[PDB]
């Protein structure tokens, strides 16, 4: 008998009233064949995991009766990494020790261990397999806990709507500084995709410029730049002397800053916004739809890989491959380990509190 | 030969500084085989004819000096009715007395007369014709000389990019007293689709609903109604009733009338930008893309039909047919019929600027 605690809510809320933590048991004697015992090493605290919990996320699990609550209650979490502590007797896609991720989203990844069936997982390498590979690198335990949500929406909108020529197309974003932006500069890097990532202006600008432009952004620009008539032509040339188009834009701020990323592109260009800065419309200009044959659409990784599991693992397995390939890297988390001297609920808490200071990983 | 008048401008303006009237000489009697002379019957003010004048428009007719001015000099008027009146011995697709309207924009058709090849013209049927063979109608001067940009307009938005059940489905558009907006509402009543009109509110609201209503609209709204958050079930309960979705949204207007449209799409909606209101940039929140799979793309009827012969022609044919049945009607325009006593050119400056009075159509 395994004894658990699950971060869970009976009622929809802010998470710092509506959070609390439930102790419940797994039977590690009592197997099925196809189940499996997993023990969680880390979990992240995204938006969309907080907007969940707030009620506003049309994508959400069911309140069961599951964890042996006096009423229905959810759990919390989409995201997540877990070890492989036991298999039954049927289970030949996982054994004790390997690493796994949820298969489905919503399925609550704050708690310490779940039980589940060997399909309610995907395997990724864990760094002794990787090693035993011949990779140079394994996947940390954040790369690993963060790999589902963040990189494959940055590598699908950059290749599964609009084909860009590799050394002369270009794709421009905002919200560069963003975990998407700056995996997104760094998948254009790696495909040969010219990129303009535009981004608030800041007191160590410079250094912020050199680091995306390591990452793989072509060009960086600021906001005031972005909406400044005057700066505009610079950026006609940059495409210019590519000898390539701007085809795609990535909107993740909405207002003036989409006008600006949309007044970039050339004819018959596609923008998709994946993202939003609090009540702040997609603002686009009527002349581009009329004139350039423009097309804004949305992006949401949870509903597009929702019925393609093939595209789903395909683009996790290049994930994979390139972190162990050491041609990507993740932002660090603010880890916070859970020893058990405080409540489950008040590390994730804390953690929603706190999320100006960074992403922040749960970890056990 | 023949005396004809053309209004000109030798540089981009308001119509009112910038254009006056080129009288020229078309050789009546020395037309190459492939030729073809025209009166025009009527042609009318449309914001887009304006709006080339003004240079603020991306398609222009080139200048040159065949009017027989002193500098280059560009005409005006992309719609119109002309009838034939003398062909080359070449042309058999068209004789004197037939009716037709340019094949291409830019042809200048602010003018009494002109001369062309064959092909720069496609055929509608007079009356006389649509008569003697047994059609209830033949169309009106305006019918034939407004049939080009409007009624093609309504018509593709509604039929080329998502097909809408019968009896079932929904458009919702704003600008619902506009031409293109009362063309759709016909069509919609033709092809058996449910519509949502949005307009702004006015002194004789009961009464323009009531028309809007007897043309085809399914219910008519006002712009407060399209901002009402409280009003949304009614419409949702509207579309639950009919067993249908809101497919395809209209866009003409911008702003918050357009978040207001879209907000009242069902998942997977479609909206389509035809016109814009001044500086009323389309204003969709994130949400609708994110999370209903909203599309925004745009409409320009000139860019759609220019390697489209075959698309325009069948929907010319439909229009032509509809109104020789009876089954379609125009607004009625104002008409200014020129005899010679006044300028050409103050005959369109006055239409200009009496624009709010209705459509203004100059007749010869």
Redesign the interface.
């Known amino acids: 008998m395994i004894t658990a605690q699950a971060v869970l809510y009976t009622q929809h809320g802010e998470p710092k009233d509506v959070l609390f933590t439930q102790s419940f048991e797994i039977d590690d004697d009592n197997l099925a064949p196809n189940e499996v015992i997993v023990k969680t090493l880390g979990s992240p605290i995204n938006p969309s995991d907080i907007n969940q919990i707030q009620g506003v996320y049309?994508s959400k699990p069911a309140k069961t009766t599951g964890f042996g609550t006096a009423e229905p209650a959810a759990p919390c979490g989409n995201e997540g990494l877990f070890e492989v502590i036991k298999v039954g007797s049927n289970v030949s896609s996982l054994e004790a020790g390997d690493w796994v991720i949820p298969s489905h989203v919503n399925f609550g990844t704050w708690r310490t261990h779940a039980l589940g069936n060997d399909d309610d997982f995907i395997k990724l390498p864990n760094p002794a397999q990787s090693k035993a590979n011949g990779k140079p690198n394994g996947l940390t335990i954040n790369q690993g806990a963060t790999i589902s949500v963040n990189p494959l929406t940055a590598y699908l909108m950059l290749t599964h709507y609009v084909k860009l020529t590799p050394g002369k197309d270009w794709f421009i974003q905002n919200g560069g500084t963003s975990a998407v932006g700056k995996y997104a500069s760094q998948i254009g890097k790696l495909l040969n995709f010219n990129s303009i990532s535009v981004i608030r202006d800041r007191p160590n600008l410079d250094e912020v410029v050199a680091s995306l432009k390591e990452l793989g952004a072509t060009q960086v620009i600021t906001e005031d730049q972005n909406n400044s008539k005057e700066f505009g032509p610079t950026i006609k040339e940059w495409i210019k002397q590519s000898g390539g188009e701007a085809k795609l834009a990535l909107n993740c701020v909405?207002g003036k800053s989409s006008?600006g990323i949309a007044r970039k592109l050339n004819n018959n260009g596609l923008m998709l916004?994946?993202?939003?800065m609090s009540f702040?419309?997609?603002?686009?200009?009527?002349?581009?739809?009329?004139?350039?044959?423009?097309?804004?659409?949305?992006?949401?990784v949870t509903?597009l890989l929702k019925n393609n599991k093939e595209l789903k693992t395909s683009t996790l397995n290049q994930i994979i491959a390139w972190y162990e390939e050491g041609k990507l890297t993740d932002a660090k988390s603010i880890e916070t380990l859970y020893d058990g001297t405080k409540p489950l609920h008040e590390l994730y808490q804390d953690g929603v509190a706190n999320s100006k200071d960074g992403k922040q990983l749960i970890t056990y």
């Open positions: 049309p909405g006008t916004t994946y993202g939003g702040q419309p997609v603002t686009i200009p009527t002349s581009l739809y009329i004139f350039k044959n423009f097309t804004s659409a949305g992006f949401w509903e």
